[PDB]
Design a protein around this ligand. Structure first.
Ligand SMILES: COc1ccc(OC)c([C@H]2CCCN2C(=O)CNC(=O)NCc2ccc(N)cc2)c1
Length: 164
């Protein structure tokens, strides 16, 4: 059964609500497992307390740099980086959950949630899940972005974990 995980998100210390994500372990088990464990924090590190550092309206909301907190960092549960598992799932529309990277085979912890179909990322970024609940929260996050990706409010994942 594909994991369901959650992110509770704040903007300037005000709760926006919860984003629930299905992780497609049936298609990308290694990538799903990484995200799942980073949500629970069971390895001793993970997403709790980290930010959405790059948010671009009509594109995506990017997060997951819990080491450098600026978009340069993060790490996986396997080591600093891990391979692109496959490109079977596509960036089909809003709600798609996908790994950020710095080129082929550089997956760490950084991820993004799409707010549109981002088809030009197919074959470059590993899609590994989608929003089950909380697109309204994602739209709120999106509304605090800008063309440059700089956020107008501090967007923090206050809590995260696994539902099932
Ligand atoms: C055509 O590819 C893209 C174009 C624009 C863009 O945002 C400006 C992106 C951003 C949002 C879509 C996700 N994405 C990236 O992955 C940009 N790359 C990074 O932010 N790289 C920093 C980084 C460093 C280490 C690790 N492990 C992952 C990412 C990608």
């Amino acid at each position: 059964g594909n994991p369901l995980v959650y992110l509770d998100v704040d903007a300037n210390g005000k709760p926006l609500g919860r984003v629930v994500l299905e992780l497609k372990a049936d298609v990308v088990p290694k990538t799903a497992e990484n995200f799942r464990a980073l949500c629970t924090g069971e390895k001793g590190f993970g997403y709790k307390g980290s930010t959405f550092h790059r948010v671009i309206p009509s594109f995506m909301c990017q997060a997951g740099d819990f080491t450098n907190h600026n978009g340069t960092g993060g790490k996986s549960i396997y080591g600093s980086r891990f391979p692109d598992e496959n490109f079977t799932l596509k960036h089909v529309g809003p709600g798609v959950l996908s790994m950020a990277n710095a080129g082929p085979n550089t997956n760490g912890s950084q991820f993004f949630i799409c707010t549109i179909k981002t088809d030009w990322l197919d074959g470059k970024h590993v899609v590994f899940g989608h929003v089950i609940e909380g697109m309204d929260v994602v739209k709120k996050i999106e509304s605090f972005g800008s063309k440059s990706g700089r956020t107008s409010k501090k967007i923090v994942i206050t809590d995260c974990g696994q539902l099932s």
